[PDB]
Design a protein around this ligand. Structure first.
Ligand SMILES: CCCCCCCCCCCCCCCCCC(=O)OC[C@H](COP(=O)([O-])OCC[N+](C)(C)C)OC(=O)CCCCCCCCCCCCCCCCC
Ligand SMILES: CCCCCCCCCCCCCCCCCC(=O)OC[C@H](COP(=O)([O-])OCC[N+](C)(C)C)OC(=O)CCCCCCCCCCCCCCCCC
Ligand SMILES: *[C@@H]1O[C@H](CO)[C@@H](O[C@@H]2O[C@H](CO)[C@@H](O)[C@H](O)[C@H]2NC(C)=O)[C@H](O)[C@H]1NC(C)=O
Ligand SMILES: *[C@@H]1O[C@H](CO)[C@@H](O[C@@H]2O[C@H](CO)[C@@H](O)[C@H](O)[C@H]2NC(C)=O)[C@H](O)[C@H]1NC(C)=O
Ligand SMILES: CC(C)CCC[C@@H](C)[C@H]1CC[C@H]2[C@@H]3CC=C4C[C@@H](O)CC[C@]4(C)[C@H]3CC[C@]12C
Ligand SMILES: CC(C)CCC[C@@H](C)[C@H]1CC[C@H]2[C@@H]3CC=C4C[C@@H](O)CC[C@]4(C)[C@H]3CC[C@]12C
Ligand SMILES: CC(C)CCC[C@@H](C)[C@H]1CC[C@H]2[C@@H]3CC=C4C[C@@H](O)CC[C@]4(C)[C@H]3CC[C@]12C
Ligand SMILES: CC(C)CCC[C@@H](C)[C@H]1CC[C@H]2[C@@H]3CC=C4C[C@@H](O)CC[C@]4(C)[C@H]3CC[C@]12C
Ligand SMILES: CC(C)CCC[C@@H](C)[C@H]1CC[C@H]2[C@@H]3CC=C4C[C@@H](O)CC[C@]4(C)[C@H]3CC[C@]12C
Ligand SMILES: CC(C)CCC[C@@H](C)[C@H]1CC[C@H]2[C@@H]3CC=C4C[C@@H](O)CC[C@]4(C)[C@H]3CC[C@]12C
Ligand SMILES: CC(C)CCC[C@@H](C)[C@H]1CC[C@H]2[C@@H]3CC=C4C[C@@H](O)CC[C@]4(C)[C@H]3CC[C@]12C
Ligand SMILES: CC(C)CCC[C@@H](C)[C@H]1CC[C@H]2[C@@H]3CC=C4C[C@@H](O)CC[C@]4(C)[C@H]3CC[C@]12C
Ligand SMILES: O=C(O)c1cccnc1Nc1cccc(C(F)(F)F)c1
Ligand SMILES: O=C(O)c1cccnc1Nc1cccc(C(F)(F)F)c1
Lengths: 515, 515
């Protein structure tokens, strides 16, 4: 198994290298298939748009200390390294809401205490570099084995709901910014962006979203359909999202008059605010002499940042490398936790954000490479060039501004909704949530339906909604960085309370390692 | 069989009365089911909107000689009579494109020759009253037996394509009338209707259409799905279009600012133009003494009007009363042709327009009453109160203006697109057109796939497209009232050329009476 206690110091790192690197030729040569090129295109727009979204949200909140340029270079650099060195290349490394909430929370603290933020992270980085090596030394990444399906399901579901919620709030914002009014003022500037509201902007956006999501779902239906020859049907199905986007991007191109929000990158490869910082950030104070207490008190935030990246990256790896998916290569949790956290702490030195292995984009990347037949899984295309070319494109995103400038965010929102529903494909919790509305006569022929009672099977599914409810309440409240500690409290339940209120035969059936 | 030559004078009319009228108690008492009330609501909006559409088109073209008021009263009066007296009440009687093209063509002639149009039709009416009785006397409605599936298929398909084409051209017209412009003038009157173009009108219409059609198709998918209890799932599925409309009508109600075209009826039960005509039209000239040559030369148009109504109403009756549909009551072609044409010729006397039995609304009405199980057909709800209550509502359409005034045409266009695809459900031509794109390995297990060769089976399907192509070309060209003569030339092919180029075993399999 991958999470066995070796005992020998850095045995978990070495066995993960001894596991995957013998298959390094297959990790390059399995990327010649056309389904992989279709994944690169799909996952590029999946990887880029958050780097633009979170990039803008950071700058706005951190006064350009770290913005779109630093996140794009981080996401590009760490992505290329992790693509070439990672134990699971299908893990797409990038910046997340969890991290966004920390950066702004550390800034808000740094301004109050009179500390140079871009410097304060370089210390947090050194502790993340220290803590990860100390964990990887004692094979602490083994603890992944104790992360059960139950928690992986709650993690798989909660983030899928958030990614869907964020997508709609992104469309709702266009109706708030450009409401359906009887009259509109045309004496408004459009150089920075529309100052006041405009006609035809918000409904065309809705149409551009609804159109792309439609063309996405129909092409997913078409992929595993009976129409057209098998060779042409799979190619069209594999290039589903690329065709979905291309159509609805051309739709808006031929609408000359109507404005709608496009993709926005910086002018070139420059620091967001030259007055604030440089490329390389000095630990002992860039301007004002940095205090000695924060140089050692940065461990407390780093312990928090570690957990956020750990429980994000590792649970993502469990979900992406499940037995039910045909994962021939395997997975290395020790090397993945080392790289993701290690690169992040080093990235802080250059005033660029530390990243994690985000589930949706990682899941989406695997799902886009996962083949289907007859339906069941036959062979999941496992290689590095997919995860590499995504990071390379996110690096070149600033240089290829003329191509991105004609792509509406409305079109991208259609694909994020598709990614949201596509992520819920192989989640037994969602599949059990479906049985809540189905009558008991029509339930699927699965062990947890046959061997367990229906009224008890729904109570388990119900207790996971009690978790999701509490998990969603913590997300909204000020104490949002306490979510990892509430998510890791999920294990104690499945280990004590659930067994205490259930029969062992039911758990094994309900919560199984494989199907 | 229904179309047997009795020989005895009016034997075909009497046997159709002796057929159905013993089941007259079941023709009332099968309308207590909730699926029938759902059909009334659906088919009302299906029956009304064309009475508004074609009414406006007549008035516009005939200078209010016959407009929305006369078509609504005709469609109401003839509908109630035919609902109570008809051999097949599922036939929804109303005005069609075929008739629209005649009325405007007879007006265009009447103005040139200096003839009172509203008077000239009263003569055409007398010949329609004469010709139908002469046909029903010799059981001429028997000729229906010779109308093969091949022609019924071409008829079923061509009209379904037209009804879909007309629906989209109705949406395209909103984008022509309210284009996506950079600027809009708000110094425009809205009393008659918007004079110049407006913002948010065209895309909200598109959204209102796309929304209703979505909610229609998902509820049709939900109807024969596994979710929710069987008692509640069928009710929601049966009231599919009523719920689809209700949602998207409320959507637009809560949009205060944005204009979009609503349902428009006249003020009250009045003649469209009091200056032109009255209620009852005098045959020997209302104002100017009507010429004696037109009193007898009105037979030539009446012969044309007869054929248009005959080939519309009878082929509709064959399609609605096919063996594959569970039609327990049966059908009477002699009594249906008598009423539809007889009432029409009498309706001309009051300047009101003559109607036909239109296929889509008749098919839609049967399809809405046709139940599904497991899928296959179990029992088609055959009754009169459905066809009655539709005509009663179309009569009350002017009185219930405050309810219709809040219903957008955009919402109705969603339902006409649903009706368009719903009409193509049980058509072997469409089902064979699907096999054109399917590979030959995946073709359905049906006699005409098993017993006939695939390459020969597609050539038959291909020759029907050669017909549809020619049929569609005649529709566009000036000689549009020659379509019935090109449609009745379909029989000679299936009778001579097709058998000449095919093997008898193939025809029986391809062109079968039952499945
Ligand atoms: C199970 C399916 C149910 C879902 C239903 C809806 C599907 C999702 C939405 C539609 C798919 C994407 C199409 C986007 C087209 C954008 C139209 C537009 O505004 O731009 C062009 C233009 C916009 O104007 P314009 O400004 O570009 O005009 C160009 C010409 N100049 C510039 C000179 C004025 O619109 C049109 O011309 C009208 C076309 C409308 C598109 C037709 C769709 C009708 C909606 C009903 C249902 C649609 C399909 C149903 C799905 C299943 C199929 C059986
Ligand atoms: C089978 C797979 C594909 C089929 C579905 C194809 C996708 C598009 C379907 C077209 C119809 C849209 C849904 C029904 C009608 C609701 C829209 C409406 O009128 O309100 C929007 C309204 C109308 O615009 P509005 O904001 O002006 O509303 C009025 C409010 N004022 C005037 C005050 C500003 O906009 C919203 O508020 C947006 C919320 C809805 C977001 C929908 C985005 C489209 C994404 C697809 C959703 C539906 C498919 C999901 C299921 C299929 C597969 C899982
Ligand atoms: C770029 O950095 C400069 C400082 O190097 C920022 O200037 C500060 O602005 C904040 C509020 O915006 C003030 O509270 C500080 O007093 C300013 N400090 C100095 C030294 O000017 C500036 O805001 C930053 N600009 C951007 C791009 O946000
Ligand atoms: C109502 O009927 C009158 C009476 O025919 C119509 O008046 C005619 O108008 C047309 C052109 O619109 C002229 O060619 C005729 O010379 C007019 N005749 C008379 C006697 O006035 C009038 O157009 C009709 N109005 C409506 C509602 O269309
Ligand atoms: C040295 C620290 C601060 C740098 C961070 C990376 C650490 C964890 C890396 C760098 C070099 C690595 C060592 C390189 C070689 C070997 C020999 C092998 O037979 C056992 C593992 C061992 C001993 C590795 C353990 C992990 C290691 C110490
Ligand atoms: C312009 C932006 C918004 C969209 C970019 C999408 C582009 C790159 C996508 C959309 C459709 C794609 C094509 C779809 C199918 C095939 C056939 C395959 O045998 C080779 C690749 C090829 C030819 C793809 C190349 C990439 C492609 C052209
Ligand atoms: C194809 C693979 C190997 C590379 C893809 C990403 C490349 C193009 C990106 C990633 C990070 C980028 C660098 C980031 C920062 C700087 C500093 C600036 O003062 C000059 C440009 C320079 C040096 C950039 C050049 C382009 C760069 C190297
Ligand atoms: C915060 C909110 C949304 C919590 C929602 C939890 C819901 C879905 C849970 C809580 C209790 C659960 C119920 C507990 C017991 C039973 C009885 C059984 O015979 C059928 C299922 C049924 C009826 C469950 C269905 C799901 C249920 C209603
Ligand atoms: C005015 C007449 C001549 C032409 C119009 C015929 C109309 C009114 C129809 C409708 C009802 C019909 C009658 C119904 C029943 C019968 C009984 C049958 O054993 C002989 C024919 C006879 C008597 C029919 C003759 C034609 C008839 C009278
Ligand atoms: C206002 C316009 C646009 C829409 C009108 C549609 C109305 C009449 C439709 C929409 C949904 C329908 C309801 C749907 C389901 C049921 C349950 C059934 O057991 C009795 C009828 C009843 C209660 C229907 C009555 C009619 C209804 C309310
Ligand atoms: C419920 C069933 C029986 C009837 C439904 C339709 C009714 C309401 C319609 C159909 C035709 C209509 C009539 C058509 C013409 C006129 C002439 C006008 O000068 C007064 C109203 C009057 C007399 C209408 C009254 C309402 C009416 C009788
Ligand atoms: C005028 C335009 C619209 C063409 C209309 C007729 C078309 C659809 C017809 C004419 C001849 C037909 C082809 C005749 C023979 C074959 C060989 C068979 O193994 C597959 C179908 C195929 C390839 C047919 C497909 C449909 C076809 C191309
Ligand atoms: O989802 C948010 O907005 C959020 C914000 C702050 C902290 N945690 C958050 N949630 C969240 C989402 C995914 C993974 C994780 C986890 F890895 F830390 F467990 C947390
Ligand atoms: O559909 C048209 O545009 C049209 C116009 C004039 C005559 N005939 C037409 N077509 C048409 C449509 C359905 C049924 C019939 C028929 F019944 F007359 F055969 C004709």
């Amino acid at each position: 198994d991958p999470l066995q206690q070796t005992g020998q110091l850095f045995g978990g790192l070495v066995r993960d290298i001894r596991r995957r690197y013998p298959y390094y030729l297959s990790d390059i040569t399995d990327a010649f298939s056309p389904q992989v090129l279709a994944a690169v295109i799909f996952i590029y727009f999946a990887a880029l748009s958050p780097a633009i979204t979170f990039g803008g949200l950071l700058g706005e909140k951190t006064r350009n200390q770290m913005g779109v340029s630093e996140l794009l270079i981080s996401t590009a650099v760490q992505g290329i390294l992790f693509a070439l060195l990672g134990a699971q290349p299908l893990l797409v490394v990038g910046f997340s809401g969890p991290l966004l909430v920390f950066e702004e929370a550390f800034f808000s603290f740094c301004e109050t205490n009179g500390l140079e933020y871009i410097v304060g992270r370089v210390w947090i980085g050194f502790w993340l570099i220290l803590l990860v090596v100390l964990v990887v030394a004692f094979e602490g990444s083994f603890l992944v084995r104790f992360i059960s399906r139950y928690t992986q399901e709650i993690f798989s579901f909660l983030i899928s709901l958030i990614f869907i919620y964020e997508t709609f709030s992104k469309l709702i914002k266009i109706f708030q910014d450009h409401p359906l009014q009887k009259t509109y003022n045309y004496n408004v500037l459009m150089v920075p962006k529309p100052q006041g509201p405009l006609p035809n902007t918000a409904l065309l956006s809705l149409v551009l979203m609804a159109g792309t999501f439609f063309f996405a779902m129909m092409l997913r239906k078409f992929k595993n359909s009976s129409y057209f020859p098998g060779k042409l049907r799979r190619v069209i199905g594999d290039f589903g999202v690329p065709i979905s986007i291309l159509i609805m991007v051309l739709v808006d191109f031929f609408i000359q008059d109507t404005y709608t929000q496009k993709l926005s990158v910086p002018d070139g490869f420059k620091v967001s605010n030259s007055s604030a910082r440089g490329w390389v950030i000095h630990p002992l104070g860039l301007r004002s002499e940095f205090p000695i207490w924060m140089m050692f008190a940065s461990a407390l935030p780093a312990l928090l940042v570690f957990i956020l990246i750990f429980l994000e990256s590792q649970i993502t790896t469990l979900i992406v490398s499940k037995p039910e998916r045909k994962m021939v290569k395997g997975s290395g949790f020790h090397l993945d936790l080392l790289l993701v956290v290690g690169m992040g702490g080093v990235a802080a030195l250059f005033g660029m954000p530390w990243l994690s292995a985000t589930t949706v984009r990682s899941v989406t990347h695997a799902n886009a490479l996962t083949v289907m037949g007859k339906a069941q899984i036959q062979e999941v295309k496992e290689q590095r060039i997919s995860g590499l070319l995504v990071a390379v494109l996110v690096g070149l995103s600033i240089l290829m501004e003329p191509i991105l400038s004609r792509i509406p965010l409305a079109v991208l929102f259609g694909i994020f909704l598709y990614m949201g529903v596509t992520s819920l494909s192989g989640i037994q919790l969602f599949d059990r949530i479906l049985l809540l509305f189905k009558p008991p006569k029509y339930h699927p022929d699965v062990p947890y339906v046959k061997r367990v009672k229906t009224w008890r099977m729904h109570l388990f599914t119900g207790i996971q909604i009690i978790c999701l409810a509490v998990l969603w309440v913590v997300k909204s409240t000020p104490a949002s960085l306490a979510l990892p500690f509430v998510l890791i409290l999920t294990v104690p339940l499945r280990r004590v309370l659930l067994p205490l209120i259930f029969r062992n035969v039911e758990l094994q059936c309900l919560d199984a390692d494989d199907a």
